[PDB]
Design a protein around this ligand. Structure first.
Ligand SMILES: [Zn+2]
Ligand SMILES: [Zn+2]
Ligand SMILES: [Zn+2]
Length: 313
């Protein structure tokens, strides 16, 4: 059955109906410049359709099957199920709230979300977050926008958004961080992340993995502490033997990071055959392939990796 409360503001009124799902919307809540006539599809449905289309699907979805994604969604559910989330763990019982179904036409809870994931119902990360949001919408309608339970539901949805974002950055890094095997941070991914010297304003130059490029910034993951930051691309150099020196407080902390970085380099050499160090102060470039070159003085010769047509798992 179609909902009666706007998906955006959670209030009743004159609302448009989606043809594909039970969601309804005030026209003004979607800043709709005009009125749709017939066969309207809502923004949640339209975002899911383009994320599930092979021609427009994300980098992460190109490397995952539906079954593989369902395994990562199970770990995301564990992160959402924090201490204090009891009210959202099981379906709301009619024995405690007999008027619940007069207001809530589409119930949702963490156990149902978990069961749906195990049954392979979600074809993209966007679909899991869209379904999870029914928990927050339902809580606002029944309990009210200022209730203590609404505050808890908002955090549950913010955790869901962060976990979906992390899967999209790199599913292999996500899986390694979830399992936490010995020296998981040093495990190379199938398309290995470039190693750089990264300088964040106010901090010493430090070794890091480069996970993404966006608007002139690099998503750096630092060796040692495993913390993260967006760093300007002009403050990043390809890894070299000579170190870009910075005045530091504790020697041993920098030492542990350099030691961990050398374990990562050895893992790359064992798996792909090579690791090319660069001359001092060589700028990092987006999606750099330098470290994998057969001959770093002849880039047109391409990668050292031998293609054995292996099904990667
Ligand atoms: Zn609205
Ligand atoms: Zn829809
Ligand atoms: Zn990765």
């Amino acid at each position: 059955r179609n909902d009666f409360y706007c998906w955006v503001c959670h209030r009743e009124g004159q609302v448009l109906c989606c043809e594909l799902c039970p969601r309804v919307y005030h026209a003004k809540c979607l800043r709709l410049t005009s009125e749709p006539e017939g066969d309207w599809f809502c923004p949640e449905c339209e975002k899911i359709t383009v994320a599930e289309c092979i021609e427009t699907q994300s980098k992460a979805m190109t490397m995952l099957t539906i079954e593989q994604l369902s395994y990562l969604l199970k770990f995301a559910i564990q992160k959402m199920k924090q201490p204090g989330t009891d009210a959202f763990q099981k379906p709301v019982p009619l024995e405690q709230h007999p008027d619940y179904a007069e207001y809530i036409f589409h119930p949702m809870d963490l156990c149902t979300l978990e069961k749906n994931a195990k049954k392979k119902m979600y074809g993209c990360t966007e679909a899991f977050l869209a379904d999870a949001k029914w928990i927050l919408h339902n809580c606002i309608i029944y309990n009210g926008g200022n209730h203590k339970l609404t505050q808890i539901a908002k955090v549950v949805i913010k955790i869901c958004e962060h976990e979906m974002n992390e899967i999209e950055v790199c599913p292999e890094c996500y899986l390694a961080a979830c399992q936490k095997r010995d020296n998981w941070f040093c495990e190379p991914c199938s398309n290995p992340h470039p190693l750089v010297w990264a300088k964040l304003k106010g901090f010493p130059f430090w070794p890091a993995k480069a996970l993404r490029d966006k608007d002139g910034q690099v998503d750096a993951r630092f060796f040692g502490q495993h913390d993260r930051a967006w760093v300007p691309i002009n403050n990043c150099y390809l890894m070299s033997k000579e170190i870009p020196f910075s005045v530091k407080k504790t020697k041993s902390i920098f030492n542990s990071a350099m030691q961990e970085m050398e374990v990562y380099v050895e893992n790359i050499r064992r798996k792909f055959g090579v690791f090319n160090y660069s001359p001092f102060r060589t700028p990092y470039t987006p999606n750099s392939q330098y470290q994998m070159l057969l001959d770093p003085t002849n880039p047109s010769a391409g990668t050292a990796k031998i293609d054995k047509q292996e099904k990667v798992k």
